[PDB]
Amino acid sequence: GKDRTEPVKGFHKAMVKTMSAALKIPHFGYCDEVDLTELVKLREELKPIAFARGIKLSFMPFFLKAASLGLLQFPILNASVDENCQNITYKASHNIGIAMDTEQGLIVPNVKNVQIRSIFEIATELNRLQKLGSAGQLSTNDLIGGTFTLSNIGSIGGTYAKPVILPPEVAIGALGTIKALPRFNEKGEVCKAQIMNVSWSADHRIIDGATVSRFSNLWKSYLENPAFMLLDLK
Amino acid sequence: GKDRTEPVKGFHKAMVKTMSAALKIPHFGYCDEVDLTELVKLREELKPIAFARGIKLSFMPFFLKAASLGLLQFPILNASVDENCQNITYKASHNIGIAMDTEQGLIVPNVKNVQIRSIFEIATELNRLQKLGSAGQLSTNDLIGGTFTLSNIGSIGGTYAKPVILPPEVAIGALGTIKALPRFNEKGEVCKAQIMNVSWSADHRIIDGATVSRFSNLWKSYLENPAFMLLDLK
Amino acid sequence: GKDRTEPVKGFHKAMVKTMSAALKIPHFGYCDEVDLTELVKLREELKPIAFARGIKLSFMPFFLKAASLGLLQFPILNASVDENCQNITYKASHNIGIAMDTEQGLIVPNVKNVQIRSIFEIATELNRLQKLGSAGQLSTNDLIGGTFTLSNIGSIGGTYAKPVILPPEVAIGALGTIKALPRFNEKGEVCKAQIMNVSWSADHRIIDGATVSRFSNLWKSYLENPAFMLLDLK
Amino acid sequence: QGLIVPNVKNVQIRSIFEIATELNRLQKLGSAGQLSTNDLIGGTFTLSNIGSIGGTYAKPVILPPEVAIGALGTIKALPRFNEKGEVCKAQIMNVSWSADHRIIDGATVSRFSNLWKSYLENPAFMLLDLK
């Protein structure tokens, strides 16, 4: 009923620091829509196997592995840049951050080395990370050395977004809500289509539009055609 | 057919200072689409009552009232931050700004204390502010004290936008054109649906994604199911 | 399996500087969807007239001509602004840049003087700049003097975007993929509509939302109903 | 020149694509009499694709010192039921396994078989544990 004034205190101080650092990066935005009908089908048929192993299976393992596969072809997106963007460090480890909000807001644990993990290992690893993170009990090692971030705004709502890049990373994407929409198929009839939006932000100092673009189509094509993923997994 | 160079004079000076000031804010964008069918119909039936009362009823009063109702639960979106985001002031009054362009550039009057005003009063205050705005007769009190801003780009066209937060506020939303699109209902059939897109921008130093998202959901449910609002209004 | 640090060098340093000089610009984002169904048809008809004159014809020359017509109406969008935004230079020529990525990064050649060129001469100029651009032989004069920029992200993929304004310009558009979507027609029946998304960013210091939105609308009606262009050309 | 059984090394660590590559080569090699000792030795397990000429079921001969072999027949389109009770075009391929009954028992070939088949009938399940 009156104005209350307060200090930005405790943990909230870190978000201020991070997002201010983020103003030094000219964000380029590139968004698209991805047809997840196959993937949803795919997932429904994998839930029984993962449940039988003690693991809930979201879409995220899929998204994460596809980005990993994507970053093999476009390593620049898994890089870091220095104080005034004079030097680029290309990172070997695909340590993808899963953006989370807690009772304390922004916290970004990462799955280490997705490049050598199975979809199933990543499920397992996300499951550990939520258990811990909602328990307020996420460790330092889980929190450092991220190379690239995904953020599932769609777990709550949303179509497109403009996510903020997390220094020293050069990219992030946001995934919206999976939604049934009327869409045409090869036959030209109106199908139910399981449609999701993705928004990528990138540091346009060193990552051009074609690279985000091309990365995005590859990532996307792994998800629309999940067999495409089968070809290069070991 | 030659290049003309001109001073930015007078009133145009202030947009320069307002927008440059917004460079210090790290903008997180979050977007959605809102199904306004029930609201379009709802407006048709109220239109004759408000015309009888002498008011023109647009969608804004509803957006505004749904925003305020939303800000009761996410009061941090109706707040301010200081020079370096050290201290947040949570504002009790919902003084929601409405952006306009005038011959003289950007002007943003606000409706005071929406938290204690009915949709109909809001309608009235809008017409008052619109008349005045376009007559160049807005008072100082009409302009000062804004706590949150809506921007109806949809009066002209557009789907999504990236609106610019107005210091010292922490959030702004842009509303796009109402468009009839084909969408599924519960029975899985193709419908006429009135769809509006909304774009929020938020100061990500103190507002996190969940906050902006859950707010958007809540706001969004008040409008897609108008009668939800009716529960807590006195 | 190893990290690698390399410097940003030579022909890459330039993208660093450009994109960093864009951080001084408060970017306003406005987006829309265009119905390109009549243009696709129209393009089909002209294709065997261009092939017979040596010219590949895409959509870009239409986009260029429709932007130039827009700019005659809204000359402030083909304008420049000084060191701290205190003078506007309104620019006669519509030198419109086409944003390209090379095996060399970001290159932005422009078509000089679109306001005095036919769609055909525009097509001719685009072809030329593509032969030269993809062979890394663009001259200095093709490179300098741009007043306004369009960027065809959609030759690769994408829906909406946040393009980064190139100083000293004040605006830029990005065009998405032309995608066949189900849409209602006049009679309220479900049609195959060729839908493209467009995304403009504009220097909000001197450009208000009204002008970006009205410009868009004009641009968009030239493309949705191409006869309108006919009316005024010589 | 008769029976020649080269082998793909270390399948457990190679991708499908990698394996298609190594077969392409093994074939160019074999069908010119130019497989090396290394291509030829060290086999742990054998498949036999009789279906490239024709056939349904078979009784292939385990190659000592290995303990199992499988033959794959032709892929024919056959009428089969789906979940819903309707008559569809199904591609049915027969497999025949022979196993050294001294140390391999019936359940093992069975379950193995089921699994292999499982991965093939539902090619997506292969996704889960590949990396």
Ligand SMILES: [Cl-]
């Ligand atoms: Cl920017």
Ligand SMILES: [Cl-]
């Ligand atoms: Cl930012």
Ligand SMILES: [Cl-]
């Ligand atoms: Cl900004």
Ligand SMILES: [Cl-]
């Ligand atoms: Cl749509």
